[PDB]
DNA sequence: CTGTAGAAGGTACCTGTAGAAGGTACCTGTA
DNA sequence: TACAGGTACCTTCTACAGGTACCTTCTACAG
């Protein structure tokens, strides 16, 4: 794959020289807008909603919305000084806890860790420790001037950096509105529902489940393109 | 806490009404573009790059790029026809384990419907003793896509899902060694490393930085 | 400085990305052998003892002298097959030793090394730990294709990689022929040296010392120049 | 141990007679080059890059390139006045600094100093006072027509004379790239790291490192020899 | 309040490429 | 043992441009 990151994952003096790959891909077909009767590609064109004027990149100033219809504009210096920029690349690891204390509810995107110059040894070690010990790293990680939280676990034969949302973004499963609490299922019922439930069971053929409207659209744009 | 979707997950005879809760919301900081000169809140307008003019909406239409600077022009009819081709419809149901959470993509909670309730709690307690997850197709709002159903807690959780062709496969990511050459020693080491830096999750102790940074440096402009 | 090796220090999970730059270099003058008529530079020719004739570079093998007269020739296979080379260039670090168990006397070459990419944290910590502790490392490394020995240990603001003589290759002190033992020492005769040695004492200044011969003959090659 | 030079530490009226010995051997593998048609081994000829006629050596004449191609012949009473001749074999003082004020990056090669003929008392007394004062003496000293300088310490029950390298051939560890200063260090990091240190910290067996290379070469000699 | 898409700027990492010299490593000779 | 001289080399940096995948941000439409 395409390497989009080279970094180390770094918890004091363990520092393993690691490379980062984009573990999914968005294959939904994208559609351009074009003119009815010419048929060119569309461009945005900024116009102020006051001046009714076209604004260069260098008129345009960031600002905050405070309120309904006010801002407090955000000089350029002050955005660079809120961010925390790092000269060194790296997945400092600040906690390590079980697997099963973070669902997969937090997970928001996907990276697949593999060794970098010099760091097999170190990564293989931490590979098999993570797993022996069935726990996950929890670090700080910056890909392009952002800054996330992730958590690095063990998935196969590979390590797999999964960014994670903030602890106060995630909702409570316990606030969500007539879920019952009660364990008050009748034996009688519960055995029916396992036997369908089993019954409707099968493996998992990743080959059997495609995008039908992505197929149809090709095709449609196959049709057209020859006719 | 707020519903933003109702209707049913179905299969067979069985047709339990559900309502869908985001699991997540989106707290990060948005910034809003102004003009140097008055304030004001800049828009956007759409003009042609061949010939510059400002177009209405019902004066562009939509064309698939199929090579480089040649598009095919989807009318909105046949486009609608294949948009075409308010139920979570369960094709089969796998194991727990055999869908890693790298296919995951959206997180929503399902609460009982109106007079839903022992229907969801006789899935949700099947669910959690055979220790599967329903496969299903569902949409949201004219995007058909894949998700799976899981039990998290005491409720129900649906995970909108990547296609398989979608996702990159483990095996072909490069330099990732073989399950063979550990050292026992070395491993012991490690694994007393990782302890030693073991502790209790504790969701209040991680925030966002620049977010606090920003609402901090925004209040003390408001006050100057 | 100039960089000559890239890699990293690993022991265990540690690894520690480095550079490693040359501790000292030859000043010493060196002399090109010339024809006496004709002052042009000499070649080696490369002749049969035997034969008589010049030998081509593929024409010559190596042999181990066994016995005086009598050699075995060691091919190009069993040469490779013997020199084990690694995919990764590693300090391995196997023992942590203390910095009085090894005298100056294994040291044969010094190499300052400093901190690679993303690599400075686990630097410092590495430092910081062998000053406090009071240890040296004892490593293996090969820098081309020659594995040796070598102690990491502090000097000042930067680590030092010395590579060191094999136990067996270090004679031992005990042995030195005529040395005596630690019989009575006269106390005014010791105190009389030690003030003998303290009126001799003074500050260690580099620029008091340098290398007279070399400056002489630089001193003639410029004043043969000139006229 | 056999006396590779006899002389004297002289210093003022202070005149000690000593042996020196070599404090280190190398027990490297040396192969023989060898002519491939009769095994027989090879001889340098020195032939001159233009007339391409083979040189006895009374026909080469030394010569110093101060500029890439041109070269200023030093004939050999040239190099014989630049050179400094002592009728006395005599490892002469200079002064005496502090054993820490010179690192082991100058040192450059070890030798063991035995006492002479009738110098046992003036050794010993030496030797106490060199370790009491924790001192070492900067000497002048040449072994066979190489003027160098030297240091004297105490090893052990032994006095150990370094040769070491001139302070312009030594770099400075404060231009090392990279290399940080030791103001941010984390507490807890700095205690994980000793804390793993001292896991592996290790009592010094010499006996437990030894040149691989240099067995499995004799061993793949005696196989081919014994077939 | 949430889902959904489109346009736009940017740059990191890989790919394709080459020259120089500084320090490694080795071999012989030679008294 | 000392001591030097010649020889093959190759690694790291210097000097180098093109291209794509992925990041990241911003606005707008729907109900």
New binding site residues.
Partial sequence: ???????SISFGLVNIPI?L??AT?DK?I????LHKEDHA????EKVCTNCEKTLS?DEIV?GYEYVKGKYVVLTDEDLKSLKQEHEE?AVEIVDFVQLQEIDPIYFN?SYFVGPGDNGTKAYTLLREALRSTGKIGIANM?????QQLAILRVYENCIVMESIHYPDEVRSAAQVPGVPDQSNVNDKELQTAITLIDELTAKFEPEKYEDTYRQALLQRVNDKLEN
């Fill in positions: 794959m395409h390497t989009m990151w080279k970094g490379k790959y984009a891909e939904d994208k559609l351009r807008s590609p569309i461009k945005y990149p960031k690349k995107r910056t890909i392009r001037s952002k």
